[PDB]
Design a protein around this ligand. Structure first.
Ligand SMILES: OC[C@H]1O[C@@H](O)[C@H](O)[C@@H](O)[C@@H]1O
Length: 301
């Protein structure tokens, strides 16, 4: 099902009391669908909308999610609903385990009848103190809750340290046929993030190139070898849930990197979703509804 996807980023994963620079809008799903994408990824920071008791998700905000998911779903888009930027659980996972499992109880109860095309992504980029042996324990506990109301819906999990290839070996594949494994890919980091203010440590880089040299192509291929090999041995399909390049980077390298990564993904039967529609990594002007053909051409011929 999933192949060509895009993230609506820096939108609903914004902090509850500080919105970021992209305003979610139904027109987005029209233009994404018409561009050739079959899949949209929607990061949502539900953790900012809980009664911090039974951890009841604010119904107001929750209705906002009904609006866009239904609209997206009523265009035949696959919608990955993604619990994004749950920051407190990365610092003290043991304190927020229950808050995490309560959150997925509500989500699964509420969209249990929804079309197959609605997919669940449990926890974006586990990092810091939520290390693998806890992450796996919480992942198994969340799937068994979800599986009472959503027994066949697709569920996406990912490894520790920002969904990193290097931590796939520690990620446990659950007892379950309907699970996709996701990694993120932005290597090399200094080229992909250069000049972006939101990427702490990268904001003052400048004019770094990716020309597609043989060593550069070789590295990319070996990194993707590592993931394919893992996925073969574990009989799971892989989803490249985020990849992209900031706008500040050199126009021509940006296109070549994105093409090369997209191509390598498809070459190995990976679904993918480009990091980010309309923000600092974007390829789409939210004010005029126009695309950056130069980058869009790299993603979809
Ligand atoms: O999704 C994680 C992060 O990635 C960056 O692209 C966004 O600009 C940041 O504000 C966000 O914290």
């Amino acid at each position: 099902k999933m192949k060509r996807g895009i993230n609506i980023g820096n939108a609903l994963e914004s902090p509850k009391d500080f919105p970021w620079d992209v305003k979610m809008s139904n027109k987005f799903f029209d233009d994404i669908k018409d561009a050739g994408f079959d899949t949209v990824r929607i990061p949502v920071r539900f953790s900012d909308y809980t009664s911090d008791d039974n951890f009841k998700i604010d119904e107001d905000f929750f209705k906002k999610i009904d609006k866009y998911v239904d609209y997206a779903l009523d265009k035949d888009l696959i919608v990955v609903l993604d619990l994004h930027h749950f920051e407190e659980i990365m610092k003290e996972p043991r304190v927020h385990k229950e808050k995490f499992l309560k959150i997925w109880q509500q989500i699964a109860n509420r969209y249990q009848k929804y079309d197959k095309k609605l997919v669940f992504e449990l926890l974006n980029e586990p990092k810091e103190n939520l290390y693998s042996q806890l992450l796996n324990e919480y992942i198994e506990e969340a799937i068994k809750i979800i599986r009472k109301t959503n027994p066949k819906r697709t569920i996406i999990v990912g490894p520790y340290n920002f969904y990193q290839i290097d931590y796939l070996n520690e990620l446990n594949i659950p007892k379950d046929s309907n699970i996709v494994v996701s990694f993120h890919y932005y290597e090399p980091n200094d080229f992909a993030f250069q000049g972006n203010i939101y990427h702490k440590g990268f904001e003052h880089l400048s004019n770094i190139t990716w020309e597609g040299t043989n060593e550069q192509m070789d590295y990319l291929k070996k990194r993707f070898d590592t993931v394919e090999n893992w996925a073969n041995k574990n009989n799971v399909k892989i989803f490249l849930g985020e990849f992209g390049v900031t706008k500040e980077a050199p126009e021509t390298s940006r296109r070549a990197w994105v093409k090369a990564v997209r191509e390598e993904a498809e070459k190995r039967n990976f679904s993918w979703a480009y990091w980010e529609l309309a923000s600092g990594f974007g390829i789409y002007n939210q004010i005029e509804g126009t695309w950056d053909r130069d980058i869009l051409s790299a993603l979809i011929e």
